[PDB]
Design a protein around this nucleic acid. Structure first.
Lengths: 46, 271
RNA sequence: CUUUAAUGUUUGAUGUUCUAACGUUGACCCGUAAUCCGGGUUGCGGACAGUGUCUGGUGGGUAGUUUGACUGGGGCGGUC
RNA sequence: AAUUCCUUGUCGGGUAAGUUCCGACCUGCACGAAUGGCGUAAUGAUGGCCAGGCUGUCUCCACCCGAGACUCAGUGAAAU
RNA sequence: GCUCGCCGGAAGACCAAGGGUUCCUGUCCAACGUUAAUCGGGGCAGGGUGAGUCGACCCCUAAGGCGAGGCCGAAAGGCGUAGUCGAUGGGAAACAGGUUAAUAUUCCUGUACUUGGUGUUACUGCGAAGGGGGGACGGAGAAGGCUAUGUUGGCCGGGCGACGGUUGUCCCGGUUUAAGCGUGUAGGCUGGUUUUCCAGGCAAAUCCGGAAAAUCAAGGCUGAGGCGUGAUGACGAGGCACUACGGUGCUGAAGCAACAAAUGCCCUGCUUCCAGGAAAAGCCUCUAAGCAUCAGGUAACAUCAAAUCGUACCCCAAACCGACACAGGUGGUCAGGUAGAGAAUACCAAGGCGCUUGAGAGAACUCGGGUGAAGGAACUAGGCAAAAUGGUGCCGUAACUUCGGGAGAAGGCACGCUGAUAUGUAGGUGAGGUCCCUCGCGGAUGGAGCUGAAAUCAGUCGAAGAUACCAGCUGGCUGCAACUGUUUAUUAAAAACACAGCACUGUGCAAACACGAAAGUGGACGUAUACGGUGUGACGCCUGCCCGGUGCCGGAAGGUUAAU
RNA sequence: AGGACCGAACCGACUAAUGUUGAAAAAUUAGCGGAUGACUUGUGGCUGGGGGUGAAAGGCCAAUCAAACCGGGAGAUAGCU
RNA sequence: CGCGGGGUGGAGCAGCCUGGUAGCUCGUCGGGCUCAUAACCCGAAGAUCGUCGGUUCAAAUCCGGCCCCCGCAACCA
RNA sequence: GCUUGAGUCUCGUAGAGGGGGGUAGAAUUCCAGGUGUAGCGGUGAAAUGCGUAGAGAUCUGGAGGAAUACCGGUGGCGAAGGCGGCCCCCUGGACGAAGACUGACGCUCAGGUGCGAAAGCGUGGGGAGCAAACAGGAUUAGAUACCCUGGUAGUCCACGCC
């Protein structure tokens, strides 16, 4: 049957994309937490 | 007029269309036509502030004139458009100077009729003049609450406010709800009851009819669970809770009216 | 002191009137290529309205909780 | 009776035989009028019952065609 | 390589989405592949994606987002004006042919088209964030005109044939060609032209609207397709030739007609109904600010430019989403032949496949199917499941009814092939010829050719002619819900929910009510024939009694009564 | 004309059988209901946790829902194994 | 079976929970009224409290038991 | 063919004839307000009811609906049903006078068609007064009635039935 993941690169970047994260203070706080964890893939991107 | 449909199919059996042949079946006058997007009953926050409404057939907002600011310019009527946004049909008036505007159509109105605004015009139907100049007891519509505001009272089809008495700048009115209410004498009012009185006789017929009217299903509280509505629950149609809106305010008999500052203008209340 | 008689005077409650506070999801002008907002003029209200603090009422709309034990399984009954 | 406990109520009809079905009786444990009452054509992957046609559903299984089961070679799990 | 079998409205052929090198060539077989494996969507090297015209970028907005100021909010921040983003929509332009192991509307050949820039020449008032026009829009239906496309004939080339006949009423194949440019057709819309005036188009306007006359009646716009040109070119069945024998080189027949025919096109049409049917730019036009010798615009001519990114490959699947090379899921486009109402079904073409374990044996038992004496629900909780019915025309058709139904009620009959009627009819199409013309893509008369039902009659074959696949079981009494619909994705599809209708009640507009501690939005750019809530649930006949209890409404005299 | 009739695509899920360490964490095969509308579907938006949305089942909200998931309070607390 | 409620002239009800004189309406009998009956008017009789015991000076009133009547409960697998 | 039947034409006359649209005055009720104080209303008698929360009585203003006083007359008109304020609009029939004209064109009428009080019904208005149903109070042996205090459909309007 139809699975829950039905990818669309546009909708993906609009949502979890870098700029989307830079919008709200909360988003920027996410990026703070990820750099602190030293994670290579900060956000998914082209 | 009223025309009952033949029962060839269910959901057609009970339909009663209101044909109005004296009405322009072509396209409306484009320059006066701005878009109106559906709200879906959802505000800025995106929440659904008003239930039910949503969906339904698309429609464009005609710009109907209300202020009737033009004075002393005679105006030949042209054709009676259908206005989906309202209940009453709207005439496409043509002033002598070439500008056109839509206006709500009074009962006695026909194509090619002469009608004028301003303090002079006449007591002929369709004329918009300040109520201080209007004879007592006469029937009027599109009354304004305040001068220049546009028009408020009596716009729905077949409705008409009836002037009752004058006193100073105030003038009493019998609103269609039976509520007596004072207004300022200088407010404009158009003569004659609004047309399309047969609007109420329509019986839509099938369920789908309401759907493209923009309406959606109204679920009874008793059907919902106790968490969703103040009613609801019980094993087999129990009830016994005093009737209330979903938000717990008492319905059926509760008074909700309280503006204080508008109280002075009212005289009799509705009954 | 009985009763309150008139006047004066302090305060209290009504009623009518006024406008300058305040309101204006009334009109019109400017900022301004702008249905926002502010400013200005004017009409409409007008000491109400409305907001703050205190206060009585109402309030399962919402929240936190309680709702015993014995018991020839428990519940009901009975009992402490 | 989607409501009736005693109840397979009583009578009729239906069947060789009918705790169900249809029509009535009213003794309504505990129907009932917009938490609607009573009828209702048409509609229903709805509930109950009867009949015709039809048949391996059955009396009562029998044979046949393919896929596995079985044997060889290769690969090679699991729950416990 | 030969044969066989399967799909063919797909199990073919293009794309988007999404993957991200899986494509191709060599090489390798450890691992991966449910076996082996010389093979691969696996390992390892190398190659491969060419654009002014396709798409994106770009211009313009929709829903919606962000939002200078601003309003509001303990802070965070919320809302929102100007603005600025945002395609799923709108906006200039290209086709055919050849070519590579892998790309091509991108390369090459041939022939085109657009928008800018710059210049030259000739003319000329040009110019907005402003005005107007245009762009710019629903559904349903009806045909008519065409084309794709196909069939047959003719034409051209080949064949005369493994076992009877087969040089002929015979067999097999091929018979294709665009965009652009010219012509403006069927067909649709519209009365045009000049003059005169203005309470309008936040200012003006020579445009737009409106009002008067005068004047001719056509003029104008849109428009599929056809016919020319493009094209004495290409393409081309096959032959001529070798060939690393994979293929390349060389040459080249005919290339028409009739008919049928769309769901494609004219048709952003027409008719009709109501539920009453995006915005903005590009485009055209009008002037203002302005500048007029300028500048700037218009036409012609030349000339430059058209950047940057995607382009391979899969794409109903072994490459996407399902942990898998997983009987699942996923949008758009094309859609041939015979029979058929048909995109169903059956058999085929192009085209692609035989589903990564096989080989035997022919027990029980299970799965998926076929058949059955005689009886025919006796089985069983229950006719569950099977079986049966099943088409097209004609006959005929009940209770009941809201007069539409019920109804495809029920129940019947006919049905193939051949001949004649008619060496194929009625019908459709429409040639030649001839007639007429405001003369062409014209109009009449004309009937050649082609296509072609259905019926009656006669005859004929089978046990059986809707012979296949395909393709209703029917009737009666009754409950409940009026109906179509919706519902527990993953054990409940119903009598539940909705529903049109009815009633009560609220709300006079800065409405009630809701979301938000506020601003503010929705309600509604609506106004009591409206809008919110609650209950009942079409239609018909109806809706009785109780205000004690509880709740609401109305009234304030008196008692009680908070802060103060 | 029609929330008309029959009936493919398309959407749905009524009955039965198989499957139940499946081919598959709800499918297959045979039949079945709707199929011009209260239809269906693509792209893109908006609504959020005591909240959303709901033709109402306490259904759905990333295989999880009488209160999502993730981190933090936190080594919660457990007269109980 | 568990609990609760009741039994009173001829009928229906009080009075019992507040052990110290048993009432109300109807019915019955009697006299009037009327031609007569009904209605109406005036009078009178009528129980000794389901029932066997206890308790008390005294029990229809309190207590227990027994016989009927009445209502609720009689459940979860 | 004729004109005495029947019919048309001319001037008129009377009339609650019909339909439509306006308008007035008296009164009832309702509302707001003043004065004023203990009863009012009702009945065979009472009671319910209303009323010290200020009734009724009284006066001023206002709002509404319906019906239309005396005129009104075994008067008039109309086929019948029926029709009563005043006023306009549209219109029917009758009658009289004098002639003129046509020339039996007439009478009745099954079936048919139309009109048809009140009540009733359907949709939508309106709602004073009155009032089935209903409620309470009395009367009575009982009183599902008569009487009293209330009161819904209805009565009124438009359009359809009957």
């Amino acid at each position: 049957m139809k699975r829950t993941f039905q990818p669309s690169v546009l909708k993906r970047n609009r949502s979890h994309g870098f700029r989307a994260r830079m919008a709200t203070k909360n988003g920027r706080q996410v990026l703070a937490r990820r750099r602190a964890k030293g994670r290579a893939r900060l956000t998914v991107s082209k | 007029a009223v025309v009952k449909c033949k029962p060839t199919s269910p959901g057609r059996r009970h339909v009663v269309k209101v044909v109005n042949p004296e009405l322009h079946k072509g396209k409306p006058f484009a320059p006066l036509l701005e878009k109106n997007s559906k709200s879906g009953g959802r505000n800025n926050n995106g929440r659904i502030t008003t239930r039910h409404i949503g969906g339904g057939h698309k429609q464009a907002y005609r710009i109907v004139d209300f202020k009737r600011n033009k004075d002393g310019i005679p105006a030949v009527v042209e054709r009676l458009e259908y206005d989906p946004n309202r209940s009453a049909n709207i005439a496409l008036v043509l002033y002598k100077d070439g500008e056109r505007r839509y206006i709500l159509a009074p009962k006695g109105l026909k194509a090619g009729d002469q009608i004028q605004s301003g303090v002079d015009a006449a007591i002929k139907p369709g004329n918009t003049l300040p109520m201080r100049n209007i004879p007592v007891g006469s029937t009027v519509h599109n009354v304004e609450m305040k001068p220049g505001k546009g028009g408020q009272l009596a716009r729905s089809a077949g409705t008409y406010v009836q002037i009752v008495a004058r006193d100073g700048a105030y003038v009493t009115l019998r609103l269609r709800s039976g509520e007596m209410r004072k207004v300022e004498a200088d407010c404009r009012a158009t003569l004659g009851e609004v047309g399309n009185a047969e609007h109420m006789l329509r019986v839509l017929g099938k369920a789908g009819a309401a759907r493209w009217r923009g309406v959606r299903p109204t679920v009874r509280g008793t059907a919902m669970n106790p968490v969703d509505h103040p009613h609801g629950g019980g094993e087999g149609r129990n009830f016994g809770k005093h009737p209330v809106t979903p938000w717990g305010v008492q319905t059926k008999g509760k008074k909700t009216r309280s503006n204080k500052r508008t109280d002075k203008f009212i005289v009799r209340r509705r009954s």
